[PDB]
Design a protein around this ligand. Structure first.
Ligand SMILES: Nc1nc2c(ncn2[C@@H]2O[C@H](COP(=O)(O)OP(=O)(O)O)[C@@H](O)[C@H]2O)c(=O)[nH]1
Ligand SMILES: Nc1nc2c(ncn2[C@@H]2O[C@H](COP(=O)(O)OP(=O)(O)O)[C@@H](O)[C@H]2O)c(=O)[nH]1
Ligand code: ALF
Ligand code: ALF
Ligand SMILES: [Mg+2]
Ligand SMILES: [Mg+2]
Lengths: 656, 656
């Protein structure tokens, strides 16, 4: 005898519904039942019409004040159906859903709930009474055509899916009853119009492409019933209701099987809760008020115009890439441009929703940040490259002078000097330095690691020259007395500093390249060694070597005097001193040796052009220590006795 | 007897209005007139109510079909006013504006016109009848509360401006007549509600901050009049109208002076056209349908979710900066990510307005382009720096070998090689190469213009060494015969190749640095010249110089023989040959000269440390050509006769 709210004001679907339903009619409800519901604008007399036509007891508006009355959705079982025969029980149990009216002013702006309940109803009912005033007929929003477009649409997008499966589907009947009908305009005429309005709604909706072909008739039947002014024509109203009672129970011309999705009642109670879950929070159904939606557009409109006012005003400071830059002149010109647009946007948008206005302010800020960044970046990089040059220069300008320790301060100062010089033009850190600083650091590391190769190949080189100096010289100084211990004093130096190489180096290392800083150095000694030999001693300076010795006793006495000859005994006794004094270093220097009499071999397989350019030959190895060739060797002693003896009897003329 | 449309359906304000108005009442209309208009939902019986209450002849809907009837806005002069005394002429001329009803279905979606005409009316009238059905009272959009919020708002934002100027302003009367009033609910009750609804509308509007303080009462009076069912209560309707006739003409309780903005009628005809201009196209009034506004939101919602689906799926390919890059592997992974989001966006947004959907597709594309660009850029630059290294290397690796002509092909190939290698990863040119290519070119130009300085300071250097070789050597070779023409053969070479310097160079020039490639070169000769002199001839190798000559005749004969002495006449005749043969080149070489006997001066003011480091001294100039000093000069001839004569009588011991 009392109804219940299947779904209360705040969207709570009800738990005790099945229980309730079965406790109303003591009959077993099995698949013997109809679901009928009502939809329309606030206070169109719906709770009244259910009450009067089924015989329910939904509250109705007390007429003292026009106000919302039905809240949420309600369900009651119809005892009897008022018909022209008076009251009449029906075969089936008739379950009637009273749904809160649309477009009330209590909830003016959040049409949240109306859309939702309108779709439960539509989704869950065999027959839906669309309850309108005649005077809503040619209306658009006043006939709820907006609300409807939505509701149907989601209905298709959310359960026009189930089908091609041949129920007993939900075709639902759209039972459209016209209230306060005067008669002046024929219902058949009202009907034409409003079905047209519904056909149009149908073409107007978003359709998932699988269903794009689907029509309104496929999903829905429509019929009509007019009802006279209840207050001013009480009787004609009453008869009109009864006439409608006969329509559904007596003639049984309304309900058909197709509406009834054909399962026991518990199946429905379930299908409902389900249907309500999928409705209560649906993405296509979530909507912000008109106001927000309006503010959004309003605010973009401005974003663009203020921005367009930002653009061709910046196409004018920066078409020209500045000649004479200043990062405090710039970060200011920047702040100022951003200041203009804001205050102009603000002048026209602070009216609207603060949040939308705010959301849309931030959007503009970063539209103009990203146009300011472009310029910031340009200069900022123009700066790096300049500085960097100086820095590269700076490195070179201190050859090897304590590398690692100068790398440090210098590289620091760069990074620091950029950070500051460029932070002045970034607008409260709005425009980022991170990517710039990273790209700088990488650049520094690229440079040092190339200045390092230049200092590490310089130390190799400028070490091979304090070697070549002390080396090719303490050859000669040694050579003014060819001893048992020349080589004993020669490689004792050749390798006395062929190690200290050169001490550590102080550059940043490369350890396994610090180490291979030497295997060029050590290869190049074993390359210049041979080259000094093949240059100090050759066919040319060898023939020459004879006389440097030759004269010291064949033309000189006992104390540095040019020998005073005595007999041709003294003339032909000091002639043979030289024949040896011009043969007696060759065993110290034919093929070059060591105080051990064993051959000298090179550290590396040179004479081969493959190990060669890693640091920039006949049959065997045109041998390393082969200073004087195949013969060239004895081509000196074909001349030993030609020139030297063109002096022995050729200077005999001076005893006469 | 016929009205006219001040503004037709499509917004054309009418030209012949003043003329029309004056031709209606033969009375002179001067400031003796009222402006009264009607506002409300389609077919609320407005044209009917004007007709019945003033006695006009606006068409009315023929009841065969519910449809729009009044189109645009109309104006007619009221002959008489129906009142309870029957018909009554009034003192003032009453000008009545019939405005097309809101919310018709003929124009369902474009509320353009209704907003506009609703605001003309409100802006232009002393009294505005808001004509509603009782059954619209507790409604929101069905009571037009949306349309209104707008209309008032713009009204404030567009002419609540004029004021603080103390007219006779437009307070306008809001004359709200309730149609088909049954009586069940007291008009006073309806009134309370609906004025409340209007107060709320008032708090709900955008207000320019100057006016934020302004209230609804400041701008507007409201009163009410109920009217019974015209068809079902013809008489009570009639009496109700008459009762309203008495209200404005008999009691004269409606019109007040404050509504009347107090100027002659032509002033009004003007104020109207003006008001209509500022309305017909106003920015706050320009609006897109609900549908678009809805699609916009709908489509952003998706943009974000599809994008968020793009982001943390890319935070996953690129958190890790790739180790092993491939630009065809990449431009593909890119296209594919962009492919996913699209087809997912498309799967959910192709429903809505194509244009909004399209607009909003493009928006997503470039959201993801700009996230793809970041990665494209990274690698793309990783590529430039690698290549560049090779290129820098490549330049150096061809010392001077035809610079300009190798600069060309090499620099081309780089640019080309980048363009191609990086175009493969840009997505149909969506992501730009322009800024990359520019930054490359600048980089190339930075490098060559530094390799050039290295090749141009090398040619200076390695030219000063084929000079120093032929130079310090054809000194000595010349010096084996100190002639009248030594210097004649010495600077003839010193400046024989101190010009060809060195021929053109073939590098890219710097012309006025190609030219200053030499004013180092020419300065450094005038620097090494002096250095060779101060090194070949000094205290050391000078004392030495004596004997190189000394021996050739004091110890040698006529053909290369060591002189065979004869008498102590032959012993002390060839002793004085040397005293000169050891003094007779000094006038060829004390201070160094020219075959003219004039001093040699340097090209540059050297000995001064200021012109110095532009290419890396006592009282006068510790003179340029001062090879042997203050004395050092005669410190050789304190020893001339010590060592050389420790040989004349010291080798006299060999005649015994
Ligand atoms: N003019 C008119 N008034 C009605 C009619 N039916 C009911 N009313 C009254 O309209 C008011 C609204 O009724 P209610 O049934 O509570 O409307 P709901 O909110 O749409 O359910 C009540 O005062 C009813 O007495 C009708 O058919 N015509
Ligand atoms: N129920 C009712 N019908 C009316 C009333 N006044 C006029 N009508 C009818 O309503 C229809 C609309 O009239 P019209 O005056 O052309 O309306 P408008 O478009 O708002 O100007 C006409 O058929 C009128 O006969 C009324 O007060 N109540
Ligand atoms: F007031 Al209602 F449905 F319109 F309860
Ligand atoms: F049909 Al109308 F104003 F509502 F002409
Ligand atoms: Mg109700
Ligand atoms: Mg009309």
């Amino acid at each position: 005898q009392d109804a219940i709210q299947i779904i209360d004001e705040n969207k709570h679907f009800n738990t005790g519904i099945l229980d309730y339903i079965n406790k109303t009619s003591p009959a077993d409800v099995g698949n013997n039942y109809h679901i009928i519901s009502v939809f329309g604008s606030q206070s169109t007399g719906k709770s009244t019409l259910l009450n009067r036509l089924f015989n329910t007891n939904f509250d109705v508006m007390d007429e003292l004040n026009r106000q919302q009355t039905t809240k949420g959705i309600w369900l009651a079982y119809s005892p009897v159906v008022s018909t022209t025969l008076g009251h009449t029980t029906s075969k089936s149990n008739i379950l009637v859903m009273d749904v809160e009216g649309t477009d009330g002013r209590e909830r003016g702006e959040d049409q949240d709930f109306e859309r939702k309940a309108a779709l439960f109803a539509l989704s869950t009912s065999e027959v839906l009474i669309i309850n309108i005033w005649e005077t809503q007929v040619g209306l658009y929003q006043g006939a709820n055509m907006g609300l409807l477009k939505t509701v149907f649409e989601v209905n298709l997008s959310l359960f026009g899916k189930s089908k091609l499966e041949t129920h007993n589907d939900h075709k639902v009947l759209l039972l459209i009853v016209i209230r306060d009908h005067v008669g002046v305009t024929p219902v058949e005429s009202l009907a034409k119009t409003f079905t047209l309005d519904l056909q149009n709604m149908w073409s107007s909706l978003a359709k998932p492409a699988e269903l794009e072909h689907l029509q309104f008739a496929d999903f829905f039947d429509v019929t009509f019933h007019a009802l006279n002014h209840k207050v001013l024509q009480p009787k004609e109203f009453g008869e009109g209701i009864n006439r409608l009672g006969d329509r559904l129970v007596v003639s049984n011309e309304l309900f058909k099987p197709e509406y009834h999705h054909d399962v026991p009642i518990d199946g429905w109670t379930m299908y409902a809760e389900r249907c309500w879950e999928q409705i209560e929070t649906n993405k296509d159904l979530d909507l912000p008020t008109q106001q927000i939606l309006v503010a959004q557009f309003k605010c973009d409109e401005i974003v663009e115009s203020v921005f367009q006012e930002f653009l061709t005003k910046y196409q004018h400071h920066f078409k020209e890439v500045d000649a004479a830059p200043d990062f405090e002149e710039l970060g200011a010109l920047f702040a100022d441009l951003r200041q203009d647009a804001f205050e102009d946007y603000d002048a026209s948008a602070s009216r609207y929703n603060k949040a939308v206005y705010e959301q849309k302010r931030k959007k503009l800020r970063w539209l103009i940040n990203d146009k300011l960044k472009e310029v910031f970046d340009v200069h900022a990089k123009n700066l790096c490259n300049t500085l960097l040059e100086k820095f590269e220069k700076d490195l070179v300008a201190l050859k090897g002078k304590d590398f690692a320790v100068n790398v440090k301060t210098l590289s620091t100062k760069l990074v620091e000097d950029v950070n500051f010089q460029v932070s002045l033009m970034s607008l409260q850190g709005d425009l980022s330095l991170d990517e710039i600083i990273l790209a700088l650091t990488k650049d520094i590391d690229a440079i040092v690691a190339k200045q390092q190769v230049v200092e590490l190949n310089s130390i190799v080189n400028k070490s091979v020259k304090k070697l070549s100096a002390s080396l090719s010289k303490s050859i000669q100084f040694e050579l003014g007395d060819p001893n048992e211990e020349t080589w004993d004093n020669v490689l004792q130096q050749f390798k006395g500093v062929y190690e200290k190489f050169g001490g550590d180096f102080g550059l940043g290392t490369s350890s396994t390249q610090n180490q291979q800083a030497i295997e060029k150095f050590k290869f190049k000694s074993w390359c210049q060694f041979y080259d000094v030999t093949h240059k100090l001693i050759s066919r040319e300076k060898l023939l020459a070597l004879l006389q440097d010795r030759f004269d010291d006793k064949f033309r000189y006495d006992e104390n540095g005097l040019p020998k005073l000859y005595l007999n041709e005994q003294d003339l032909e006794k000091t002639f043979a001193v030289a024949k040896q004094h011009a043969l007696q270093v060759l065993p110290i220097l034919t093929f070059a040796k060591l105080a051990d009499g064993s051959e000298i071999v090179p550290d590396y397989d040179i004479f081969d052009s493959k190990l060669r350019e890693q640091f920039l030959d006949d049959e065997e190895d045109h041998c390393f220590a082969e200073i004087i060739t195949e013969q060239e060797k004895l081509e000196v002693l074909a001349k030993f006795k030609k020139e030297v003896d063109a002096k022995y009897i050729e200077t005999k003329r001076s005893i006469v």
